[PDB]
Amino acid sequence: MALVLLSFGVPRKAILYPHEEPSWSLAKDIVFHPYWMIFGEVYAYEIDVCANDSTLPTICGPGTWLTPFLQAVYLFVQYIIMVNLLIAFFNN
Amino acid sequence: MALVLLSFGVPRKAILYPHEEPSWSLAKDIVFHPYWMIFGEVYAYEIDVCANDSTLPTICGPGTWLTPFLQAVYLFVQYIIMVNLLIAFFNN
Numbered sequence A, B: 001m002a003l004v005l006l007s008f009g010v011p012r013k014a015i016l017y018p019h020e021e022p023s024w025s026l027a028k029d030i031v032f033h034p035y036w037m038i039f040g041e042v043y044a045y046e047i048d049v050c051a052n053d054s055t056l057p058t059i060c061g062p063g064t065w066l067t068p069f070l071q072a073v074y075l076f077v078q079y080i081i082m083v084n085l086l087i088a089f090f091n092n
């Protein structure tokens, strides 16, 4: 579950925030939101930053249409596989 | 689950709200948000009160960078251990 997290957080941060200098915030932002997704927070208005209802309209740019695909895959793997494998683990 | 709640709510309220006089609101605020976290509410924009997207920018201060670590631990214990132990309890 922590590998699936960084498999997602590093492409997400890199596609959406390219013009970043080295900063310890990069360590946070690859790990922060993807963890809070495990706990019910979809960040519905930060998906598809190029949308009209977006809360991150300044983040719209080239390649940012990839992030909703990435996150669809992410949560499928987390909840529909890895959370229920863990429910299955405990119950058995 | 109620002990894990107060293990979290009392450090959270104390790190973020230091300049408080005695008040019956302290009884609420150590118990209120941590309970609503069990039920899907991550309070995504009250985590990291020193962030740009914060809804509590006036709460930013010394030591408030500790609260996202505390809450990461909190929900791990609630859902990933204590909710699924309870799913496991009932099913067995």
Ligand SMILES: CCCCCCCC/C=C/CCCCCCCC(=O)O[C@@H](COC(=O)CCCCCCCCCCCCCCC)COP(=O)([O-])OCC[N+](C)(C)C
Pocket (backbone or CB within 6 Å): A048, A050, A051, A052, A065, A068, A069, A072
């Ligand atoms: C192997 C397993 C197979 C998986 C299943 C198949 C996968 C699903 C496939 C879905 C098809 C793809 C949909 C996008 C189509 C093109 C979008 C486009 O051109 O314009 C849009 C861009 O929007 C984007 O670029 C966002 C991309 C879509 C994200 C989909 C995430 C998956 C969620 C669901 C996953 C579950 C799927 C459930 C299946 C039933 C917007 O239009 P525009 O003119 O560019 O902009 C208008 C301006 N505005 C934005 C300000 C309003």
Ligand SMILES: CCCCCCCC/C=C/CCCCCCCC(=O)O[C@@H](COC(=O)CCCCCCCCCCCCCCC)COP(=O)([O-])OCC[N+](C)(C)C
Pocket (backbone or CB within 6 Å): A050, A051, A060, A061, A062, A063, A064, A065
């Ligand atoms: C289930 C039923 C679903 C329906 C199926 C029908 C599919 C139809 C396919 C439509 C694709 C073509 C439409 C857009 C044409 C290009 C121009 C455009 O609008 O680009 C948009 C992005 O989107 C793209 O650039 C294209 C996205 C391609 C992938 C779509 C999913 C492939 C099928 C599924 C496979 C998935 C893999 C699954 C893995 C498990 C850019 O628009 P924007 O984002 O608003 O940004 C504009 C602003 N900006 C210039 C500042 C950036």
Ligand SMILES: CCCCCCCC/C=C/CCCCCCCC(=O)O[C@@H](COC(=O)CCCCCCCCCCCCCCC)COP(=O)([O-])OCC[N+](C)(C)C
Pocket (backbone or CB within 6 Å): A002, A003, A005, A006, A024, A025, A027, A028, A031, A032, A035, B048, B050, B051, B052, B065, B068, B069, B072
């Ligand atoms: C034993 C078990 C091991 C556990 C695993 C390892 C634990 C994970 C470890 C993560 C590493 C720590 C990340 C923070 C790094 C420093 C941040 C910094 O310097 O600046 C940031 C401060 O931000 C903070 O102070 C918030 C602290 C991070 C909260 C992380 C919570 C854990 C969520 C994930 C947990 C799951 C982890 C998943 C693992 C794959 C911001 O930068 P700034 O310049 O200060 O401010 C810029 C201004 N601005 C804010 C207005 C924009």
Ligand SMILES: CCCCCCCC/C=C/CCCCCCCC(=O)O[C@@H](COC(=O)CCCCCCCCCCCCCCC)COP(=O)([O-])OCC[N+](C)(C)C
Pocket (backbone or CB within 6 Å): A024, A027, A028, A031, B050, B051, B060, B061, B062, B063, B064, B065, B069
């Ligand atoms: C998995 C991969 C993850 C990546 C790993 C890489 C780690 C890199 C480590 C980076 C730490 C150093 C960077 C910051 C330097 C100090 C200055 C600074 O910006 O301070 C910031 C806070 O943050 C801190 O003060 C430091 C946080 C230390 C703990 C980080 C996690 C330790 C590793 C994990 C262990 C966890 C235990 C797990 C338990 C299970 C203050 O910034 P702010 O918050 O925006 O507030 C500013 C405004 N104010 C002045 C009003 C307050």
Ligand SMILES: CCCCCCCC/C=C\CCCCCCCC(=O)O[C@@H](COC(=O)CCCCCCCCCCCCCCC)COP(=O)([O-])OCC[N+](C)(C)C
Pocket (backbone or CB within 6 Å): A060, A061, A062, A063, A064
């Ligand atoms: C394969 C499933 C079916 C889909 C088939 C059809 C799709 C085939 C694949 C990809 C289609 C790529 C073209 C679509 C973009 C057109 C619109 C556009 O310009 O968008 C963006 C750029 O986008 C790019 O520059 C695209 C980057 C190259 C593609 C990288 C591979 C991604 C998919 C993985 C590989 C594929 C395999 C994945 C396996 C599932 C917008 O940038 P811009 O134009 O500069 O906007 C101006 C910005 N400004 C205003 C802020 C200045």
Ligand SMILES: CCCCCCCC/C=C\CCCCCCCC(=O)O[C@@H](COC(=O)CCCCCCCCCCCCCCC)COP(=O)([O-])OCC[N+](C)(C)C
Pocket (backbone or CB within 6 Å): B060, B061, B062, B063, B064
């Ligand atoms: C251990 C895991 C790896 C991490 C190792 C590296 C980290 C090692 C540990 C801790 C690092 C502490 C220093 C980081 C803060 C630097 C930036 C700063 O000033 O932040 C804040 C202060 O912060 C403090 O004053 C810190 C308080 C002391 C640390 C208490 C222990 C916490 C961790 C538990 C013990 C550790 C064991 C935990 C086990 C997991 C900001 O306050 P300020 O400066 O006044 O801001 C101005 C505010 N104004 C503008 C509103 C006026």
Ligand SMILES: C[C@@H]1CC[C@@]2(OC1)O[C@H]1C[C@H]3[C@@H]4CC=C5C[C@@H](OCCC(CO)CO)CC[C@]5(C)[C@H]4CC[C@]3(C)[C@H]1[C@@H]2C
Pocket (backbone or CB within 6 Å): A006, A022, A023, A024, A025, A026, A027
């Ligand atoms: C196998 C796993 C693959 C993913 C991963 O773990 C192992 O690989 C690690 C490498 C880390 C980076 C290494 C060096 C720096 C430079 C630093 O520069 C301070 C600049 C300035 C502050 O303003 C000084 O004053 C910023 C942080 C950064 C980019 C690290 C981020 C976290 C990264 C990406 C880690 C990540 C979790």
Ligand SMILES: C[C@@H]1CC[C@@]2(OC1)O[C@H]1C[C@H]3[C@@H]4CC=C5C[C@@H](OCCC(CO)CO)CC[C@]5(C)[C@H]4CC[C@]3(C)[C@H]1[C@@H]2C
Pocket (backbone or CB within 6 Å): B006, B022, B023, B024, B025, B026, B027
């Ligand atoms: C084992 C467990 C450890 C945690 C815990 O349970 C037991 O320990 C309890 C002690 C309680 C406090 C005791 C006294 C007061 C003073 C009062 O002062 C009114 C001031 C003014 C109003 O404006 C009068 O007019 C405000 C409330 C406060 C601080 C209690 C808060 C809840 C606390 C922290 C409880 C908490 C749930």
